[PDB]
Amino acid sequence: TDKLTSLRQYTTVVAATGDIAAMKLYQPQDATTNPSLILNAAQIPEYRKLIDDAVAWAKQQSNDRAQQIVDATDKLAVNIGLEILKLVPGRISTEVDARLSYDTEASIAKAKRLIKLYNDAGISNDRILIKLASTWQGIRAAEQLEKEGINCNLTLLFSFAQARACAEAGVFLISPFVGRILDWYKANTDKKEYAPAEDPGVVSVSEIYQYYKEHGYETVVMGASFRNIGEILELAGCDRLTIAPALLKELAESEGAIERKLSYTGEVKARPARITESEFLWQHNQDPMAVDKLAEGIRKFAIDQEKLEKMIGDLL
């Protein structure tokens, strides 16, 4: 059989895209989106209908141009999620405005607003994951949201300190990155070529997976961001993996079964005391790669958010 089919025996397959065409081809269980993917999807000609509905709905909610742009942008993200939910049995991940990444209260409010829009469309909370950046503020927001019945997807996770803080907050799922970690090493280190087993991104997710299973944490581990199929195959066994359409195609066209790589067969160990903000900040900033990438990831998503607002602005 093919690699994709084989991988499904050990790992739940998730598609990283806002394009419904991929949902029909690979039949993933869940789908994930982010500000950049939403911006790109808005370019798809067939999605024109989704944009017009968002704008029309917005103008029916208020007569304030400022509020219309925000309502239109949020509704568009939700409308795209709605189309995807028609083709997948699982969940859709929708990300909150990245400009609120360092504001706990504002993030909680925005998350509840998005949940409200999904509910108004008839979708219940068990089919959604609100996506937030893994800053200390985002983690504190998620801990509160989970208590109120809203499940979260903690993304842009680079350091071990982030992974630990997320597990202790009891979040539903984490999206530790692989590929962006590789990018950092290729650009700031001597070694430009890495064997799958020594890929820094692969090692990071593997260590996080071990820590989570070893201590009985229920948080779902979903590896994200890939540069080649080698990284994916090296993580076979991870709870879930969200993969871009291009790599999904490569897996489906290659023959040969694969072997499970990630597993924890021991018994659960006792959990340590919770990490404090001071300890979190110290440990996270000890990692040069994580310091650069977390901040950069937030900057980029914020820029794409602004570009989307521009686009919608010229339509009001």
* Positions marked active-site: 131
Tokens 């950049």 belong to 36
Contact 155, 123 (CB under 8 A): no
CA distance 146 to 236: 28
Q: Least CB distance from residue 135 to a second copy, whole Å?
A: 8
Task: Tell whether residue 9 is a contact of a second copy (CB under 8 A).
Answer: no
Burial 75-93 (b: 16+ CB within 10 A, else e): bbbbbbbbbbbeebebbbb
Q: Least CB distance from residue 303 to a second copy, whole Å?
A: 11
Token pair, residue 271, equals 């959990």
Among 298, 305, 308, 312, binds a second copy (CB under 8 A): 298
**Could you please report the per-residue DSSP string of 233-273?**
HHTTTSSEEEE-HHHHHHHHH-BS---------S------P
Please state the length of the chain: 316
Q: Least CB distance from residue 162 to a second copy, whole Å?
A: 15
Binding track, positions 122-151, relative to a second copy; x by CB under 8 A: -------------x-x--------------
Q: Least CB distance from residue 300 to a second copy, whole Å?
A: 12
- Subset of residues 248 to 287 that bind a second copy, contact rule: CB under 8 A: 277-278, 281-282, 285-286
Burial 112-121 (b: 16+ CB within 10 A, else e): eebbebbeee
Task: Tell whether residue 50 is a contact of a second copy (CB under 8 A).
Answer: no
Q: Which of 185, 132, 173 is nearest to 298 (CA)?
A: 132
Query: CA of 304: how far to CAs of 19, 40, 54, 98, 293, in Å?
Result: 17, 9, 18, 9, 17
Q: Least CB distance from residue 287 to a second copy, whole Å?
A: 9
Task: Tell whether residue 99 is a contact of a second copy (CB under 8 A).
Answer: yes
CA distance 31 to 23: 8
Token pair, residue 24, equals 């029909």
Task: Tell whether residue 103 is a contact of a second copy (CB under 8 A).
Answer: yes
3-class secondary-structure state, position 223? strand
Task: Tell whether residue 288 is a contact of a second copy (CB under 8 A).
Answer: yes
Among 102, 109, 246, 269, binds a second copy (CB under 8 A): 102
Where does this chain touch a second copy (CB under 8 A) — which range of 151-159, 167-175, 202-210, 291-299? 291-299
Task: Tell whether residue 311 is a contact of a second copy (CB under 8 A).
Answer: no
75 versus 164: smaller Cβ distance to a second copy:
164
2 versus 282: smaller Cβ distance to a second copy:
282
Q: Least CB distance from residue 285 to a second copy, whole Å?
A: 4
Among 101, 134, 162, 175, binds a second copy (CB under 8 A): 101
Token pair, residue 216, equals 């009985």
Task: Tell whether residue 303 is a contact of a second copy (CB under 8 A).
Answer: no
Q: Which residues of the shown chain bind a second copy in the complex (CB under 8 A)?
A: 99, 101-103, 106, 135, 137, 277-278, 281-282, 285-286, 288, 291-292, 295-296, 298-299
